[PDB]
């Protein structure tokens, strides 16, 4: 099987091409994570997926989405992630983290209470940043304050002093989050950039924030370890021929700027889309970027199906595929893929102590 | 469903009829436990079940099934339980604990490195004990010495420090290991139980050393916490009606003596039986003895297909399902369990960053 190829990427060695992509748990608190995400994290590693990419990881207090969201804009946010990487590294799995920025979209209520942008007058809320001060709309009206240029400089330094504490923390693997409406993506995007400095207006201008970011991060990220980032390719905004066209010259830009492997998503920039949800609806765009880039890449949404999954491989669409729901139903959905795929002695994807008794 | 339903016993209440059987992981050192246990209990209790008993442990050290075998034997071995106990009682679980002492079948290899006695000459063995100095056979061919009254004495004890210290490492159930051939299994069975004095012999003293134990633990462990024990009530011998008998007209003595419930089993005392293997094939033999000692019983053996699980409760053949292997595949087992017998809102058998997702 393909999905049970190893894949080596830098100096990681990956056991198999299965990815658990960043899911949100909501369960920290003032960004310091516990013993939910331990256990939920090392559980998961067990499973036998590997690459375990840790849920969006604020770079700062106001770039959480929400009150309960994972924080690593200190040393002693960093500290507590160290005993979860290392009992991923135990399980056999590669530690990755997605380092964030929420944007416009931060300050929001957990998803099951609410949603939405945190009332005004709610002690927990705060004021959101975005490049320009426009509302995502919808269920997220709050208008945030435009960014000034130390805003920028600042959020940017954020971003590095968190891949700093992240490779310090031992993890193998980082992702950026220009993806899904957030800070990153924000700035890429005419919907929510309309600045007239250096960093809106023009393509090269709305690429500056990441390409600098990027760049920022490099310097301190080990040029050993994979460097990525996840990043909405298209909007299904009646714009996307030409939204994909500019998003492929970015995604060369980041492989010329030193990125080893691109999580292609949508944007989710603005509300009032139409997204054809279905089973691996992505393959056909994520293989479009790859090609065209030159990349590899990895992508996500209805891949539980462990006959899509090895179908996406076979057809080169994708390098590695990102399981997320079909993992929160069924911690060792890997042991479930290998049976599926005919995989020899396919339990012993998990660890001796439940292998030894599949068989 | 009545899978789905409640469970009281004494102060405890369970949320549905699932029970975690007790699972020995052959990951313990010394016979303390480490991150391995922590995960695998607290990523259990997360799926849903309403009772979670954790594997055999020894109430001292040659009590041991093997080296990997998790321990009791000591203050500082408790301990290590109590940040466990309470990640299953976060969960909302029920923490259980299963007390054993491995007999004549200890000092063995793990079951992926043998599964048979250790070399007398390897620096891991021991010496094991027994009623009688007779071997169990096959892959167990070690003769143990047979015991004296003192470690008669002193064996209860170990039982009873091991039931307190459960009960101040927070645990809400207890579960006497009286099965499976070992120690107290092999004072029952006449073909292990060659004694001439007052643990041998006639039915009451071969029973003498079981109900001894029980009623010198009932000292010490709550009267509002279930006091359990978990028994083989047959051996598949060629003498099961009149092993039957003996072993129900016990149970009636282990009611009279304050059991809560009993878990009914396989004696497993010697290896040439011939055991019909089936899903649920211990239904009947199980609802006979809660039928005629009139005691509250679970059992195991190919109950994780949902609709079994359903059958044996709405039968009355069980109180409680214990689901051992299945759990192992899948610690969301009860998820699964939920949506297959048709549970409204079945996701929010899982904590909400799951449950929310799935629906
Ligand atoms: C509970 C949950 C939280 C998520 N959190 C994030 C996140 O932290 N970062 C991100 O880039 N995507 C996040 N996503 C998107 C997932 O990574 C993934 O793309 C999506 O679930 C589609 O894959 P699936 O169909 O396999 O679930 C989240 C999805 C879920 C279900
Ligand atoms: C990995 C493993 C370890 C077990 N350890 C014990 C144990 O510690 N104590 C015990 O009484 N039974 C033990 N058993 C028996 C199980 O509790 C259970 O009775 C058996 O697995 C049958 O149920 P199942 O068909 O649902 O797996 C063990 C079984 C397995 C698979
Ligand atoms: O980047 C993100 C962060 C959280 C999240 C939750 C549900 C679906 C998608 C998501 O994407
Ligand atoms: O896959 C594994 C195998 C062994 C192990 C030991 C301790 C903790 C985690 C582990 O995971
Ligand atoms: O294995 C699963 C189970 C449930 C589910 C629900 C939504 C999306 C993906 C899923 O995968
Ligand atoms: O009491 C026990 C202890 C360990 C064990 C392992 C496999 C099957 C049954 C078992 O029973
Ligand atoms: O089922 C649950 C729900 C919440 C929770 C929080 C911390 C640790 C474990 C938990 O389990
Ligand atoms: O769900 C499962 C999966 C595998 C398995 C193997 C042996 C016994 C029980 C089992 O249950």
Same mark, same amino acid.
């Given at each position: 099987? +393909? ?12 056991? &198999? ?16 994570? &516990?013993?939910?995400? !331990?256990? !939920?994290? +090392? ?10 990419? *840790?849920?969006?990881?604020? *770079? ?16 002693? !946010? ?30 929001? &209520? ?7 942008? =945190? ?9 959101? =940043?975005? #490049?320009?001060? =426009? ?19 600042? *959020? ?13 923390? %031992? ?6 989050? $220009? ?23 023009? $393509?090269?201008?709305?690429?500056? $924030?990441?390409?600098?970011?990027? +760049?920022?991060?490099?310097? @301190?990220?080990?040029? &050993? ?12 905004? %009646? ?8 998003? =492929? ?7 010329? %700027? ?45 891949? %539980?199906? #462990? ?15 990102? @399981?997320?729901? +079909? ?8 042991? $479930? ?23």
């Amino acid at each position: 099987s +393909a999905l049970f190829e190893p894949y080596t990427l830098k100096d990681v060695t990956l056991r &198999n091409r299965i990815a658990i992509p960043p899911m949100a748990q909501y369960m920290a608190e003032d960004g310091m994570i &516990n013993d939910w995400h !331990h256990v !939920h994290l +090392a559980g998961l590693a067990r499973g036998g997926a590997g690459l375990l990419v *840790v849920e969006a990881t604020a *770079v700062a207090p106001e770039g959480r989405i929400t009150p309960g969201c994972a924080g690593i804009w200190s040393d002693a !946010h960093a500290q507590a992630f160290v005993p979860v990487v290392q009992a991923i590294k135990a399980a056999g799995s590669v530690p990755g983290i997605q380092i964030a920025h929420a944007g416009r979209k931060a300050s929001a &209520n957990r998803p099951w209470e609410g949603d939405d942008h =945190i009332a005004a007058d709610d002690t927990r809320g705060w004021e959101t =940043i975005a #490049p320009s001060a =426009i509302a995502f709309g919808a269920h997220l009206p709050k208008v945030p304050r435009e960014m000034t240029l130390d805003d920028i400089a600042r *959020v940017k330094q954020d971003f590095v002093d968190a891949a700093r504490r992240a490779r310090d923390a %031992g993890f193998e693997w980082i992702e950026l989050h $220009f993806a899904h409406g957030y800070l990153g993506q924000s700035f890429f995007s005419e919907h929510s950039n309309k600045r007239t400095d250096a960093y809106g207006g023009s $393509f090269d201008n709305r690429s500056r $924030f990441l390409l600098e970011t990027l +760049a920022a991060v490099r310097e @301190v990220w080990p040029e &050993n370890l994979p460097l990525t980032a996840r990043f909405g390719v298209l909007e299904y905004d %009646g714009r996307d021929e030409q939204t994909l066209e500019e998003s =492929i010259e970015l995604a060369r830009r980041f492989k010329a %700027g030193g990125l080893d492997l691109l999580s292609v998503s949508v944007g989710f920039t603005i509300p009032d889309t139409n997204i054809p949800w279905g089973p691996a609806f992505m393959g056909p765009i994520a293989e479009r970027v790859r090609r065209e880039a030159k990349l590899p890449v990895t992508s996500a949404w209805g891949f %539980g199906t #462990p006959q899509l999954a090895e179908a996406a491989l076979q057809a080169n669409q994708l390098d590695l595929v990102s @399981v997320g729901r +079909a993992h929160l139903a069924d911690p060792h959905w890997a042991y $479930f893929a290998a049976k599926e795929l005919g995989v020899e002695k396919a339990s012993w994807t998990l660890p001796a102590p439940y292998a030894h008794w599949l068989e």
